Structures are given as structure tokens and as C-alpha cells.
């Protein structure tokens, strides 16, 4: 019983644990912001993000798999649970500034989880990690 992973195209990254299934995408588009949303610091912050047990667990399993140091690494954003807009958690993965050291660490993560990933993040430009619950693809096995 280990969460399923799927690689498609380059940009179409997929994951499934239990009943929940997400889509990890990288782009400069912004949907989550501080004060406006939630600030996940440690994996006990994530439990008030979703109501489903597999939706909370897969998100915390994915962040411990990439090597997100809950002490050293900067906190990330999430969508309030009592929100109909859905489920989405955003990780600032910009390859320039203060998050440059974290972005290259997050860049090597995808190179060991999804094995091969030519990063859709621009080294020296704004880039944001965004996971949204999608359907399990037809092409993706199991």
C-alpha cells in the first residue's frame, strides 16, 4: 500500500492515494495568498484543509516525499476547508531570491519521485507549485 504516481507529457503530473487523486502543475499563475488563505507550517496544519482522510494524507505524504523540512523550509499556502471552491495547496517554488535554495531542493525531488521531469519553472523567474484534485486519467495505469 504505497501511493500511486503517474508521469504524462511533462506538465501532466499525477498522484493517487486511497480515493483521492491530484494534479501537480508548475506555472507563474497565482491562486493562493497569505492573510487571504491558510499558512501550513507542520503536517497538523493540513488537516483543516480538507474533510476527506485520503485528501489530507496524500498531501502530507507528497510533501514528506519531496523532502519538505517542516522546520527549515518555508511554509506553504492552502485553501480553507469550509470553501466550495474545492481543494488546492500551493507551494512557492520560485528559483530566484530566498526560495532559490528551496526550489533546487524541490527540483531534485521531482527528479526522484517522478524520475524524469524537465521543470516547467524558470530559473530566475516566478514559479508556483499547484495541486488540484483531478480524475484518475485513462492513460495512467492502476
Amino acid at each position, epitope marked *: 500500500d504505497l501511493p500511486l504516481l503517474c508521469t504524462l507529457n511533462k506538465s501532466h503530473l499525477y498522484i493517487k492515494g486511497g480515493n483521492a487523486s491530484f*494534479k501537480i*502543475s508548475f*506555472d*507563474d*499563475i*497565482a*491562486v493562493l*495568498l*497569505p*492573510e*487571504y488563505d491558510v499558512i501550513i507550517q507542520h503536517p497538523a496544519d493540513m488537516s483543516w484543509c480538507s474533510k476527506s482522510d485520503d485528501q489530507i494524507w496524500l498531501s502530507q505524504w507528497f510533501m514528506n516525499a519531496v523532502g519538505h523540512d517542516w522546520y527549515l523550509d518555508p511554509p506553504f499556502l492552502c*485553501r480553507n476547508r469550509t*470553501k*466550495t*471552491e*474545492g481543494f*488546492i495547496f500551493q507551494v512557492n517554488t520560485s528559483k530566484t531570491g530566498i526560495n532559490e535554495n528551496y526550489a533546487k531542493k524541490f527540483k531534485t525531488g521531482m527528479h526522484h519521485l517522478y524520475r524524469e521531469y524537465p521543470d516547467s519553472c524558470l530559473d530566475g523567474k*516566478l514559479c508556483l507549485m*499547484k495541486a*488540484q484534485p*483531478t480524475s484518475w486519467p485513462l492513460q495512467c495505469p492502476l
Partner: antibody, heavy 126, light 102 residues
Framework: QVQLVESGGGVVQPGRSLRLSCAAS????????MHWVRQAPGKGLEWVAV????????NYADSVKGRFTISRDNSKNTLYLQMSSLRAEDTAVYYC???????????????????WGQGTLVTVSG | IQMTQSPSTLSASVGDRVTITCRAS??????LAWYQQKPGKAPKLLIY???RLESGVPSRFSGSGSGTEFTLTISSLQPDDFATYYC????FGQGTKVEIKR
């Protein structure tokens, strides 16, 4: 094909409630989130309320928030704005606006307005 | 999380490389839009997420900006561009009325 029409409302003495509707057509109404915009001639634009599509009414603008309500009926395909305990400063034109998602894998809250209404001038005076 | 638009009234002639600025109290990256309101009609959405133009808006309009500072430039404005422009997000801009030079 997208059209947004308002019901009507004019004179109202400060304090008396006034109810306004917004009929929608030409697009999937139950999917795109809908909301209102206040526009006085001597200030320009101002956002007043927001309601997520298919229930779960979100907050309003604190400028007026506590004294009125916003509703949504997906069967009639109309929007609502019930303005109660009015003040003289609400002398404005009320537009009806939509938009949700962003052409890519994003859906969740968009204070953007791609499609507007016509606006009904509501003068609050006794 | 509050908007600040400048100038007050942009007085420029047809053909000029006119540009409007916008400020934000909180560090807002891509949650901004620009509007075009010819007095007598509701504003039209010009550009969304400060960089991507709306489907069916002239190419002369160009929005640029990220972090806290945003700019809307019109390369060579035509007579059908003279209106009041506003910023987006929760709060709104004051309105940079664009008048002709005579």
C-alpha cells in the same frame, strides 16, 4: 451570446429596504460565480458583494456588509441583492458581473469580471 | 491588500505611448486586472492576472507587473480608448481619467 439584465429600483427613503434581481442567459449560470458592483457618479467603481456558484454565499464588502443580503437561484437563473436599512450614501448604479476559473487548471475564487450588466440607478433620498 | 492608482487625469494626444501605474498594500503577484469604462456604459475587462489580455481586446494594450507594482501601457492609442481605467483585486483604483491634448 452572454447577456445580464437587471430588474429595477429607483427612489427609496433612507432606512427602507429595496430588493434587486439580475436575470442571466447565454452561458452556464450554475457554474460561473456571480456578484454585484456599486457605482456612484462621483467616485466611479466599488465592489459590493460576492456569491459562489451553486450555494455557499461568501462575504460582502465591509463598506456596507452587515446591513443587507445577496442571494442566488440557479433554477430561475437570476441573482439577488436585498438592500435593507439604507443610508443616503448608497446613491449609485448597480451592475451585475460574473467570471470564475482561469484558462488552465485553476477554478477557485476570481474577483475578475469579464461579463457585465446594464445597471439600475438607485437614488437613496426621502 | 488595498489599491493605489496614479495619475489622477492623464492628458495625452492620439499616437503617444501612454502608461498607467498601480500599487498594492500587500505583496500581490498575479491577482490584478484592468478595466475600460467609457462614461455611460459598464467597464469592459481589458487584461486579467496583470499579463494576459482578455479574448477580444486590442493589442496596443499591454499590462506588465508582479510583486506589488503593475503598469498598463497603450502603445499608440486610438480615439476609442478615451475612458476611465481602474485596478482590480478586493479593493479598487481611484480612476486615471484619460483626456486628449488640445
Amino acid at each position: 451570446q452572454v447577456q445580464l439584465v437587471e430588474s429595477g429600483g429607483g427612489v427609496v427613503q433612507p432606512g427602507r429596504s429595496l430588493r434587486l434581481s439580475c436575470a442571466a442567459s447565454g452561458f452556464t449560470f450554475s457554474s460561473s460565480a456571480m456578484h454585484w458592483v456599486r457605482q456612484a457618479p462621483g467616485k466611479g467603481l466599488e465592489w459590493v458583494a460576492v456569491i459562489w456558484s451553486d450555494g455557499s454565499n461568501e462575504n460582502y464588502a465591509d463598506s456596507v456588509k452587515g446591513r443587507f443580503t445577496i442571494s442566488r437561484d440557479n433554477s430561475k437563473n437570476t441573482l439577488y441583492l436585498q438592500m435593507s436599512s439604507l443610508r443616503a450614501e448608497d446613491t449609485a448604479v448597480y451592475y451585475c458581473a460574473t467570471d470564475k476559473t482561469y484558462v488552465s487548471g485553476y477554478t477557485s475564487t476570481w474577483y475578475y469580471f469579464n461579463y457585465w450588466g446594464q445597471g439600475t440607478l438607485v437614488t437613496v433620498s426621502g | 491588500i488595498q489599491m493605489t492608482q496614479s495619475p489622477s487625469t492623464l492628458s495625452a494626444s492620439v499616437g503617444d505611448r501612454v502608461t498607467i501605474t498601480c500599487r498594492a498594500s500587500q505583496s500581490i503577484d498575479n491577482w490584478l486586472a484592468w478595466y475600460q469604462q467609457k462614461p455611460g456604459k459598464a467597464p469592459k475587462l481589458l487584461i486579467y492576472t496583470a499579463s494576459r489580455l482578455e479574448s477580444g481586446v486590442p493589442s496596443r494594450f499591454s499590462g506588465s507587473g508582479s510583486g506589488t507594482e503593475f503598469t498598463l501601457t497603450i502603445s499608440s492609442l486610438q480615439p476609442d480608448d478615451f475612458a476611465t481605467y481602474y485596478c482590480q483585486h478586493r479593493t479598487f483604483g481611484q480612476g486615471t481619467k484619460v483626456e486628449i491634448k488640445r
